[PDB]
């Protein structure tokens, strides 16, 4: 059972990193980012599966999640579908302080909170998630 899930999640991690690199190059080559949109359905289906959350946290897929959420050097934000799906997945999983330390997603969350091109609903969700993640540190 679960060794296999870790291998599949690692393969998904490699695919996500490769798709992000390809989309960044395509934007640098004057082409729209399409690979992330192509991979979005499979990532959504994997993330929606609750029992795989433990394996996701054991493979630290949140690093690739943050890589996708990281704005590209052209100062262009990711597609709204990607942001919405990743926010929903982040809400749907029990993120603890150790996972945040491994991934460092707090920096991107703070950037999303401070930014204004971000959707106001995403702004409120980012504030809520940041407060929830600061909750265990102070008590």
């Amino acid at each position: 059972l679960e060794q296999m899930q870790d291998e599949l999640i690692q393969q998904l991690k490699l695919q996500m990193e490769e798709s992000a690199i390809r989309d960044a190059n395509n934007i640098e080559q004057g082409k729209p980012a399409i690979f992330k949109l192509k991979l979005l359905p499979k990532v959504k289906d994997i993330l929606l599966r609750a029992n795989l959350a433990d394996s996701i946290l054991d493979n630290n897929l949140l690093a690739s999640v943050r890589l996708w959420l990281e704005p590209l050097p052209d100062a262009s934000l990711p597609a709204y579908q990607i942001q919405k799906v990743l926010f929903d997945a982040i809400k749907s999983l029990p993120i603890k302080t150790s996972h945040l330390r491994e991934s460092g997603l707090g920096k991107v969350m703070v950037f999303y909170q401070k930014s204004k091109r971000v959707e106001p609903n995403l702004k409120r969700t980012a504030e809520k998630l940041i407060s929830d993640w600061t909750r265990p540190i102070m008590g």
Binding site: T97, R101, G104, G106, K107, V108, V110, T134
Partner: peptide, 29 residues
């Protein structure tokens, strides 16, 4: 708060400089 966990909070959430330049570019545009 307490200093060491304040450092831990900084490590988790960053000072923003990882994307302060992104914010500056956004406000410029």
């Amino acid at each position: 708060l307490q200093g060491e966990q304040y450092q831990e909070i900084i490590e988790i959430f960053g000072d923003g400089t990882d994307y302060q330049w992104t914010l500056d570019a956004e406000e410029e545009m």
